[PDB]
Amino acid sequence: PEMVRGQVFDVGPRYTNLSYIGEGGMVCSAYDNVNKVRVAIKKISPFEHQTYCQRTLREIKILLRFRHENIIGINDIIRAPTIEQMKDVYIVQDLMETDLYKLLKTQHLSNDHICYFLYQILRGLKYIHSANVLHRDLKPSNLLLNTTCDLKICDFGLARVADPDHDHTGFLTEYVATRWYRAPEIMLNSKGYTKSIDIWSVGCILAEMLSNRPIFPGKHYLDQLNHILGILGSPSQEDLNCIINLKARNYLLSLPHKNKVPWNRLFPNADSKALDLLDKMLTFNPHKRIEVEQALAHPYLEQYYDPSDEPIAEAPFKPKEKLKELIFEETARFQPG
């Protein structure tokens, strides 16, 4: 049994020469003796918990169905031959040089790189959204990059089927996405069941690519809205009229007027077309926010835009013990024979 930091990392004879990558459960790289490339392997041990089972099953199901150049695939899944003996699952994925979190911490991005990264994010997102799926946790660290800057979206653990008719909820209740990338409506009146949630996150990522700093670095859940409104300025009457919930609307009406910070002041070196797109992605009113297909068609991305090479999904998506069986069944295809 292969060990890494005194923990079982039991990936069998196919995968040898392991290195600790990080405890995201545990991630290691390994040499794939069939394909003769190094690969990334994630040990998952979810079987005690409803929620870990749920996220693991949901994610395996999604990644196995999706097939897209800008979405991480599952290459293999390793587990014991029986439910009884299955205590962990190993997911094998392409080893990627880096991720956009890592890259932003150290590397200035040229406008060509920002454009290309944005294109690839949106291309992948077009596919996701076309499958009626919301990623719901887009952020730099979930955007993987190889040495030639090919980008792949990962981590669908928090994804959901879109459900715009049931999106409404009360004020300060919802926690969807990672804070800095969370759309204002999540705090106000949204369960994050609409595609606009992901576009907001992409907007935030784009801003972060322009400056290497998060645009809305909320210190905590509540501060996040302070940041958003500090840049977007006070919502318009029309946008407030769109919020029927009184607690949310009256909270916003209670705030002192704040003016918009012009994007070309926040990002003086940015391409003007990039800022135009950014503006459209970081629109306060999620109904007015650009959608993924419009974003791909924006002038900023004209060098790459090619709808015929921006595929959509063929097959949109519509207790723990049973989830273990479903995880066991979902991973069956990877067993010998």
Describe this structure in words.
A motif (TXY) lies at residues 173-175. GO terms for molecular function: ATP binding; DNA binding; identical protein binding; MAP kinase activity; phosphatase binding; phosphotyrosine residue binding; protein serine kinase activity; protein serine/threonine kinase activity. Its main location: cytoplasm. Residues 15-301 form the Protein kinase domain. This protein has helices at 50-65, 100-106, 111-130, 184-188, 196-211, 221-232, 237-241, 246-254, 263-266, 272-281, 292-296, 320-331; strands at residues 3-4, 7-8, 15-22, 27-32, 37-44, 76-78, 89-94, 98-99, 133-134, 143-145, 151-153, 160-161. The protein has a domain at 98-309: Transferase(Phosphotransferase) domain 1 (Transferase(Phosphotransferase), domain 1, Orthogonal Bundle). It has 337 residues and is α+β, with helices and mostly antiparallel strands.
User: Based on the structure given, which CATH architecture of the domain at 98-309 is correct?
Assistant: Orthogonal Bundle
Distance between the termini: 23 Å
Query: Helical segment tally?
Result: 12
Shape: globular
User: What is the H level of CATH, i.e. the homologous superfamily of the domain at 98-309?
Assistant: Transferase(Phosphotransferase) domain 1
Q: What class do helices, strands and sheet pairing give? A: alpha+beta
Q: Could you tell me the number of beta strands?
A: 12
In terms of DSSP E residues, the strand content is 5-15%
Determine the fraction of residues in helical runs and give it as a percent range.
Answer: 25-40%
Task: Please compute the radius of gyration using only Cα atoms.
Answer: 21 Å
Order of helices and strands: EEEEEHEEEHHEEEEHHHHHHHHH
Strand order of the largest sheet: 3-4-5-7-6
CATH class categorisation of the domain at 98-309: Mainly Alpha
Q: What would the CATH topology of the domain at 98-309 be?
A: Transferase(Phosphotransferase), domain 1
Q: How many strands, which pairing sense, and closed or not: the largest β-sheet?
A: 5 strands, antiparallel
Modified residues (Phosphotyrosine): 175
Enzyme class: transferase
Motif (TXY): 173-175
Protein name: Mitogen-activated protein kinase 1
